[PDB]
Amino acid sequence: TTICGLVCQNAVILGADTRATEGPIVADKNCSKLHYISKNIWCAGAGVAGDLEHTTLWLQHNVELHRLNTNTQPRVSMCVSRLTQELFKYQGYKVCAIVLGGVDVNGPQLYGIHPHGSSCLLPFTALGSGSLNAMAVLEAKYRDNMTIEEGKNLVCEAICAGIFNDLGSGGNVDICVITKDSYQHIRPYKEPNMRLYHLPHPTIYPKGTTPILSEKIEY
Amino acid sequence: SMYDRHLTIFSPDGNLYQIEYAIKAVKNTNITSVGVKGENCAVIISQKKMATQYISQDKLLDYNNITNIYNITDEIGCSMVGMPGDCLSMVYKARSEASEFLYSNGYNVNAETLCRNICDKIQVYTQHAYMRLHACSGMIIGIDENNKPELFKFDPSGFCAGYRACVIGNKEQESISVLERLLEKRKKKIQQETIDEDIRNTTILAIEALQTILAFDLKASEIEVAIVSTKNRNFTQISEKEIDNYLTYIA
Amino acid sequence: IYNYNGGCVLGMSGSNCVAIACDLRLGANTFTTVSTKFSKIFKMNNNVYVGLSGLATDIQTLYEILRYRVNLYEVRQDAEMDVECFANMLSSILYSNRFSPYFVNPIVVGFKLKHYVDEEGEKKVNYEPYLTAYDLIGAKCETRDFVVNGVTSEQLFGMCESLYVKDQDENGLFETISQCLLSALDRDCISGWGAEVLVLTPEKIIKKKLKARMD
Amino acid sequence: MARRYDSRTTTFSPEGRLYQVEYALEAINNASITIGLITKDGVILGADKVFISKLIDKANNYEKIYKIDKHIFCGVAGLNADANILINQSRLYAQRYLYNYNEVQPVSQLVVQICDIKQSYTQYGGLRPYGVSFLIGGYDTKDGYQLYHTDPSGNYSGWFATAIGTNNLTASSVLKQEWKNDMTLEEGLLLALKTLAKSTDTEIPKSEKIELAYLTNKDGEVYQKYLTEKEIEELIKLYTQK
Amino acid sequence: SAGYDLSVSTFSPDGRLYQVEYIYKSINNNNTALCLECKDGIICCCINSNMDKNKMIKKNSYNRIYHVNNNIIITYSGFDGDARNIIDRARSEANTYYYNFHTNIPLHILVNRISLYIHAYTLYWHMRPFAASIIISSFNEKDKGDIYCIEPNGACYKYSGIVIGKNKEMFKTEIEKKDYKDINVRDAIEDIYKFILTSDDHMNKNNLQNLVNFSWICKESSYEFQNIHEEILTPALNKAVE
Amino acid sequence: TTIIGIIYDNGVMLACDSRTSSGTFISNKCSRKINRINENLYVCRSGASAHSQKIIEIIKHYCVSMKNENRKKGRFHEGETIYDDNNLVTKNKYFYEDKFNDYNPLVENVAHITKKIIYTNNNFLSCALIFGGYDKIKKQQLYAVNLNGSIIEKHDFAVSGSGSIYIQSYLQDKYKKFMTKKECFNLILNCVKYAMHNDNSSGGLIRIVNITKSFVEEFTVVNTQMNFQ
Amino acid sequence: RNLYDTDNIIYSPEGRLYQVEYASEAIKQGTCAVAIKSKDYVVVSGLKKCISKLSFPQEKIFKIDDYIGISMSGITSDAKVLTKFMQNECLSHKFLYNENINIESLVRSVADKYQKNTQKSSKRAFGVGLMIAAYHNEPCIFETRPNGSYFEYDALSFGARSHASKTYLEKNLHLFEECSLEELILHCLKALKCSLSSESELTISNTALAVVGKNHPWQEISSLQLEEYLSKVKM
Amino acid sequence: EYSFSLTTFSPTGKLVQIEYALNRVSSSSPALGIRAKNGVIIATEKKSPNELIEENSIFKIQQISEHIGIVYAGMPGDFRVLLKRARKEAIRYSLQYGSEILVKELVKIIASIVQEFTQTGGVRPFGLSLLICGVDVYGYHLYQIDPSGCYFNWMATCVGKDYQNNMSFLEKRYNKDIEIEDAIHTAILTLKESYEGVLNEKNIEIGVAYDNKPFKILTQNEIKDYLIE
Structure with a gap:
């Protein structure tokens, strides 16, 4: 749970780790914590994965329904007002810190939501357990109007700082670029290799015990 | 039964006569309101006259009060023409939608979404027999997020077409011809260098259309214009001191 | 998820087949067993197998709802329901009880049923494994290989990580998931009174009940 | 007050009947016909497809014999519109x-x-x-x-x-x-x-027409329905013996 | 009129909405009400002409002059019950405004809210439309007074003086003789009596200390609602003419 | 956080720090606390950040609803034409100014907007607000909405937030009845800077907003404090 | 006429609500009832109705509060709803507060109860008119018509032969200074006898009569007390 | 007493109110749907209007979802309320199941809503007919929904005025293995021959499915190239 995002010269860049944990142990090394709200806005979240995953689905489809009744591309501020009112109703129970960034008729804007319903427009941020580790490297290196390429690898360092220094975050890093025309969501981007690889040793066919075998064929 | 008195029941020819009768109710007021759309500028006109109703006409009413032009938000304005009670009720419904849209979505309603939402209610009347249509047809102007003008007209029958030179009143059968003709002159003029000439290309165009649609003289105290052009985007009622300034461009 | 009614559910993916396994215990209290037939693997559809682990009340109560809606979907459809549509339904069903949760940790296992031409003279095509795992509030922790839940989720993760290989046939996959389950149940004292491995292929379904240690 | 506008659809007639049901029975006496048949093997339902046009898909659908459950099915005769409400x-x-x-x-x-x-x-x-x-x-x-x-x-x-x-x-x-x-x-x-x-x-019959289905429980309630192809054999068999 | 005039929610083929113009002839056969602006304050007037043959009512009990917020005069001419329903609703809106805004409701939106409440009843099968024409007035120092008349079916119109009731045509033609906006309020009481004595069809004749009752909101009332004390009526009863 | 409001001779001045701290950690620097409700009045919001932001959203909806409702029908003020620095001494003083839609017929009173809060947060909701803006009848005015919906009109100055207590007596001394714009700006700038020097809820840049009869000007100041003693 | 009568919503082409004009004459069939207001007393008398010479006379006068009493004239069932409403209103006010309900405010509270049964079409106008006679701090008499309307009077009459009784009251201006209730109760009883048909039943000890005044809470006039009053009426 | 059916069975056993609704559908502009081997075409003619109107502001071919289009022929007011209500179902379905709703279930849901107004009290039947076309994992679809509520599966259909001979024209020019490009050619021709005073430019409309591409509405630049023949 290390998510981050920053505003660039004409686009927003969102980066996130890939790891879901039961708290002592890790469930999977590859969880897409980035989410598609619309073609021009994307969101990333932290907190409980239950409330986090539904809310984005609820947000994405409300936005899409809004983008159909209305005939213009969705506003970034529209989702912030939609989420925060939803989060405000459930006083603090729907705990999900969310960063959503995108572009609209205004500039590339990025918002950091909070589980209690508060929001704030930022040039760069980071949430999750590795937020503090990721926010440090962000501040030390952030500038205004960074180029897309230069700002893209800054998030790589921003996430990798949380990947390595935080226990609760790890795995591959994934990035999304939310430029006006379209997005670019790169699913693998990092996490180097060359450890002691486990030798595959499959147990032979005559194993197990199987008191019963109720074979049947369906069609 | 023979009761075509119902608001909804299809007549054997497939028509809803109540829709036709409600439209006839708007024509009965013989109040003509004209709005035209230019380049990054929209203007709208009404007649500042008593709706033709049972009550005695103008003797002591302060004519300043009598207007057919309202505004829905700081940037969206409308010209409801119809029964005075229905027009007053229509704007309050319209104002609530633009207010609710703002609170629920965090940004100001489009001029095209507001009238579409309005039409989605006028349809409910059309389909529920327990109530009655608002005999009110309105024209809505505004500026979208692309700094482009927008003009839309809705009808007692839920219908939200949206024109670029629109007329409502009792002369729309022939006002469609003059407005089409009079709007082609600004197309024949291909100077294309009019830099914020809403004052002298659009407002004067609309006043000329009203002077031609109905053949009176248009005293400055019996008309009113409102413009939501870019560089204002506020739907400000243009004062009488410069309305007769355009009325002095009969030359 | 509770120590009460301790039980675990495991699923694994082979080369062109998937295997879903569970333990058959039904423990009344933590350390008190009452039944060893309590199969936690249910057949939602011909190629959609769900595995419910947790409190048996919510295991059954959720299973009634799932079976009541899959049938309603399929009958209203005249079309076999696919996993990723069903899987998302299970995610929303659990969330609808966000504040009165169904104390279960479901597993959804079954083929994905792509539908390209497969030939100039064919209609439907090969299948995809589609393993996925949830929790009590329905977080879709989709995974390309083994997924586990239950009280031995942590015991099963370690063994599966060190024994699972990329692709295996029906015979090879069954042995690995059986070893990954038997030797993981033997380290739990609240689950594992008899396993039931159910490896299924696009053509057939194999049900085996292992001679698990009962202790 | 819409009292003058009401039809009193739930009111007895002078002869103790209900006119709305009286007319509804008349509506379903002008709809397409549906046949039911119980055999030892299973129960047969077959209805007649009212012709609309040759452009109808008539391949993967027909609107008379629906599926209510794996072991129950119905053949509708009447207003097709509100059947789907009851189905x-x-x-x-x-x-x-x-x-x-x-x-x-x-x-x-x-x-x-x-x-x-x-x-x-x-x-x-x-x-x-x-x-x-x-x-x-x-x-x-x-x-x-x-x-x-x-x-x-x-x-x-x-x-x-x-x-x-x-x-x-x-x-x-x-x-x-x-x-x-x-x-x-x-x-x-x-x-x-x-x-x-x-x-x-x-x-x-023509097989661009009446369609057939049955249950014939085989300890698994097979519940099969005919595409048009299988009915030519049924049409062929009818021709041979009739 | 051929069956289109039964319910308020039907439009006649010529567009005119019946069942509302019938109300208009109900108020126009009712006791007249008057309200005009002067240079110091609004003065209202209600001539209870229908209550002359009774000879049993208490002298100055009946009163159609009501006030809200102590600085807004509301008078009507129609059904004394239907109008009284609106006054309680007008007071409710004034209270609702104060509970929210710590300020007396501005008059120009009080008439708007009342116009919608009155109009809301002209939209349904069941609801009976109100049969009252409402006159609302208020005076301020920084801005002079203003009078609105809320007819049935909305239509709130701002006036500089209005008469509604049975003889409103014979009252207006006499009021417009003088520009009362420059006339004092004390001597305008004399003028309206001359209209009541003449323009009223013998309903009121020299015995009207009781049939007609009215109030102002003027400077001598500190711009607050106040019925005129009887010691000012009789000096205004110097109507001895011919 | 900290929040100030000073009423000078021809307007009202609102200042605040810009920091939303969450338990000795700043969730974000440069968080807006001078929120615009209407062209003529602004709101200083403090307390729990989640509660204050969601109150402001409600009030803006009420403000819009009542602004266009109290719009008189016709045309007014036909012929009337009633109309009328600090030069970066404080370093990095950003700035822009906008003008009203004057005569105040449309825009509503500050007292109207003020008791929206009581009517709204007379609840179990923790947020303290300061309301300041221009008004047609009461020229410039400053309402302090307390924790449970307790408004009182402050005719001199109002302070709130955690850092208010550190400048409670500093401000009571430097205050004068009719301060000019320059004196009020320096006073309100030094009040915040002192409330920031000795409070761990000290913002980053400080945002000062001035409401006058015909315009609102907004400054953001980036500065620290260095006593010589 | 035939069309403009079915419901209580349609206005006749002359703007008349027939279905409340029709209920307004149900009061014209009830027996006469007369209220007289003195300087500090109110006297209410009504003629009870005997449907047979076995039946007991129907009750006409009802007590609402200590100093409030009424005399219905119309449909008895409709009146019973109003008395319960008024009684439950004066008691609640004497419970929520410790005062006596303002009689002016109480009449308005019951005059708009008539109203709410007139806007809707699923309801009907009350067929009963009331005679709210009370002494709050000064004597006062009210009357509520089936259409929402109420007035403060100095004398009343209800329905049966009210025009006959009104003539007696319309020509009597003494009632204001008519102290000495004996002199005032005779004035009301003579009025009630005036409406009473000749060559028929005379006013007997089966006609209601009650008083309310300064220090006189609403009390019936007992038959032994009432009996001698009828004797002076014969004079 | 205010909720009683206005649609009642006539003595001859016909819902006569529905027969009136179908009369008005049979007098509107002809909408038309055609499905091909690799896509579906829905086309409607929008009569040549005055230059005052903005043609793009009204579109009889709206879009339900990524692959599901729609077109109507009836009262424009009812289309909007039905289209807006149809989009909620397409979103409500996707809020439960991951995939986009498919046409068969969408049509059944919508038809159940058109049927409700046929039976429930105090309301009139919908005065329009819809043509919902889409692309699914089960191939291409083209359905039609009557005002009565019953829906039909079509390969090619017409719903507008004079659809009797309009559909007879399609029967002799349609085959199952028709190319999508040829389908548009036939779709233009059938509208062209029915439209009296053939000026079929600026007064036509096309919507295409294109073999599992997202549903797209051809703007007029992409239409004039289809009017050569």
Whole structure:
């Protein structure tokens, strides 16, 4: 749970780790914590994965329904007002810190939501357990109007700082670029290799015990 | 039964006569309101006259009060023409939608979404027999997020077409011809260098259309214009001191 | 998820087949067993197998709802329901009880049923494994290989990580998931009174009940 | 006050009948015909597809014989529009019984549920009745194959063979004269074609027309439905013996 | 009129909405009410002409002059019950405004809210439209007074002086003789009596200390609602003419 | 956080720090706390950040609803034409100014907007607000909405937030009845800077907003404090 | 006429609500009832109705509060709803507060109860008119018509032969200074006798009569007390 | 007493109110749907209007979802309320199941809503007919929904005025293995021959499915190239 995002010269860049944990142990090394709200806005979240995953689905489809009744591309501020009112109703129970960034008729804007319903427009941020580790490297290196390429690898360092220094975050890093025309969501981007690889040793066919075998064929 | 008195029941020819009768109710007021759309500028006109109703006409009413032009938000304005009670009720419904849209979505309603939402209610009347249509047809102007003008007209029958030179009143059968003709002159003029000439290309165009649609003289105290052009985007009622300034461009 | 009614559910993916396994215990209290037939693997559809682990009340109560809606979907459809549509339904069903949760940790296992031409003279095509795992509030922790839940989720993760290989046939996959389950149940004292491995292929379904240690 | 505008759809007539149900029965007496048949192997339902155009898909669909549950199915004759209201309702009923009692709903119990809702509208509510009546054939382990014929009034009745729809009399006559108590599945299918052909006074059916389905429980309730291809053999077989 | 004038929610083929113009002839056969602006304050007037033959009412009990917020005069001319329903609703809106805004409701939106409440009843089968024409007035120092007249079916119109009731045509033609906006309020009381004595069809004749009752909101009332004390009526009863 | 409001001779001045701290950690620097409700009045929001932001959203909806409702029908003020620095001494003083839609017929009173809060947060909701803006009748005014919906009109100055207590007596001394714009700006700038020097809820840049009869000007100041003693 | 009568919503082409004009004459069939207001007393008398010479006379006068009493004239069932409403209103006010309900405010509270049964079409106008006679701090008499309307009077009459009784009251201006209730109760009783048909039943000890005044709470006039009053009426 | 059916069975057993609704559908502009081997075409003619109107502001071919289009022929007011209500179902379905709703279930849901107004009290039947076309994992679809509520599966259909001979024209020019490009050619021709005073430019409309591409509405630049023949 290390998510981050920053505003660039004409686009927003969102980066996130890939790891879901039961708290002592890790469930999977590859969880897409980035989410598609619309073609021009994307969101990333932290907190409980239950409330986090539904809310984005609820947000994405409300936005899409809004983008159909209305005939213009969705506003970034529209989702912030939609989420925060939803989060405000459930006083603090729907705990999900969310960063959503995108572009609209205004500039590339990025918002950091909070589980209690508060929001704030930022040039760069980071949430999750590795937020503090990721926010440090962000501040030390952030500038205004960074180029897309230069700002893209800054998030790589921003996430990798949380990947390595935080226990609760790890795995591959994934990035999304939310430029006006379209997005670019790169699913693998990092996490180097060359450890002691486990030798595959499959147990032979005559194993197990199987008191019963109720074979049947369906069609 | 023979009761075509119902608001909804299809007549054997497939028509809803109540829709036709409600439209006839708007024509009965013989109040003509004209709005035209230019380049990054929209203007709208009404007649500042008593709706033709049972009550005695103008003797002591302060004519300043009598207007057919309202505004829905700081940037969206409308010209409801119809029964005075229905027009007053229509704007309050319209104002609530633009207010609710703002609170629920965090940004100001489009001029095209507001009238579409309005039409989605006028349809409910059309389909529920327990109530009655608002005999009110309105024209809505505004500026979208692309700094482009927008003009839309809705009808007692839920219908939200949206024109670029629109007329409502009792002369729309022939006002469609003059407005089409009079709007082609600004197309024949291909100077294309009019830099914020809403004052002298659009407002004067609309006043000329009203002077031609109905053949009176248009005293400055019996008309009113409102413009939501870019560089204002506020739907400000243009004062009488410069309305007769355009009325002095009969030359 | 509770120590009460301790039980675990495991699923694994082979080369062109998937295997879903569970333990058959039904423990009344933590350390008190009452039944060893309590199969936690249910057949939602011909190629959609769900595995419910947790409190048996919510295991059954959720299973009634799932079976009541899959049938309603399929009958209203005249079309076999696919996993990723069903899987998302299970995610929303659990969330609808966000504040009165169904104390279960479901597993959804079954083929994905792509539908390209497969030939100039064919209609439907090969299948995809589609393993996925949830929790009590329905977080879709989709995974390309083994997924586990239950009280031995942590015991099963370690063994599966060190024994699972990329692709295996029906015979090879069954042995690995059986070893990954038997030797993981033997380290739990609240689950594992008899396993039931159910490896299924696009053509057939194999049900085996292992001679698990009962202790 | 819309008192003058009301029709009083739930009011008795001077002769003790209900005019709305009286007319609804008339509506379903002009709809396409539907045939029910119980054989030893299974129950046969076959209805007549009213012709609309050759541009109809007529490949993967037909709007007379729906599926209510894995072991129950119906053949609708009447207003097709509000049938789907009752079909969806009965689908809900047959699936909620399985939710409560953890077993499939017996056919005789679904019918009384779907007939109570059909009757409730003509008892109270001031709404028009359901101008729809459909045979509901199904297999239940308690009383075997069953066939029930419903009514807009809400009163149903078990049957061995019924031919509701237009020209039902000419199709009940042939059913009554040729329905042997013990029939094989293929024998019953031929009978269904014979009564469908004679009801619409055609010597031979066309297979761009009447469609057929059955249950024939094979310990698994196979519940098969015919695409048009399988009916040529049925049409071929009818031609050979008739 | 051929059946289109029964319910308020039907439009006649010529567009005119009946059942509302019938109300207009109900108020126009009712006791007249008057309200005009002067240079110091609004003065209202209600001539209870229908209450002359009774000879049993208490002298100055009946009163159609009501006030809200102590600085807004509301008078009507129609059904004394239907109008009294609106006054309680007008007071409710004034209270609702104060509970929210710590400020007396501005008059120009009080008439808007009342116009919608009155109009809301002209939109339904069941609801009976109100049969009252409402006159609302208020005076301030920084801005002079203003009078609104809320007819049935909305239509709130701002006036500089209005008469509504049976003889409103014979009252207006006499009021417009003088520009009362420059006339004092003390001597305007004399003028309206001359209209009551003449323009009233012999309903009121030299015995009207009781039939007609009215109030102002002027400077001598500190711009607050106040009925005129009887010691000022009789000096205004120097009507001895011819 | 900290929040100030000073009423000078011809307007009202609102200042605040810009920091939303969450338990000795700043969730974000440069968080807006001078929120615009209407062209003529602004709101200083403090307390729990989640509660204050969601109150402001409600009030803006009420403000819009009542602004266009109290719009008189016709045309007014036909012929009337009633109309009328600090030069970066404080370093990095950003700035822009906008003008009203004057005569105040449309825009509503500050007292109207003020008791929206009581009517709204007379609840179990923790947020303290300061309301300041221009008004047609009461020229410039400053309402302090307390924790449970307790408004009192402050005719001199109002302070709130955690850092208010550190400048409670500093401000009571430097205050004068009719301060000019320059004196009020320096006073309100030094009040915040002192409330920031000795409070761990000290913002980053400080945002000062001035409401006058015909315009609102907004400054953001980036500065620290260095006593010589 | 035939069309403009069916419901209580349609206005006649002359703007008349027939279905409340029709209920307004149900009061014209009830027996006469007369209220007289003195300087500090109110006297209410009504003629009870005997449907047979076995039946007991129907009750006409009802007590609402300590100093409030009424005399219905119309449909008895409709009146019973209003007395319960008024009684439950004066008691609640004497419970929520410790005062006596303002009689002016109480009449308005019951005058708009008539109203709410007139806007809707599922309801009907009350067929009963009331005579709210009370002494709050000064004597006062009210009357509520079936259409929402109320007035403060100095004398009343209800329905049966009210025009006959009104003539007696319309020509009597003494009632204001008519102290000495004996002199005032005779004035009301003579009025009630005036409406009473000749060559028929005379005013007997089966006619209601009650008083309310300064220190006189609403009390019936007992038959032994009432009996001698009837004697002076014969004079 | 205010909820009683206005649609009642006539003595001859016909819902006569529905027969009136179908009369008005049979007098509107002809909408038309055609499905091909690799896509579906829905086309409607929008009569040549005055230059005052903005043609793009009204579109009889709206879009339900990524692959599901729609077109109507009836009262424009009812289309909007039905289209807006149809989009909720397409979103409500996707809020439960991951995939986009498919046409068969969408049509059944919508038809159940058109049927409700046929039976429920105090309301009139919908005065329009819809043509919902889409691309699914089960191939291409083209359905039609009557005002009565019953829906039909079509390969090619017409719903507007004079659809009797309009559909007869399609029967002799349609085959199952028709190319999508040829389908548009036939779709233009059938509208062209029915439209009296053939000026079929600026007064036509096309919507295409294109073999599992997202549903797209051809703007007029992409239409004039289809009017050569």
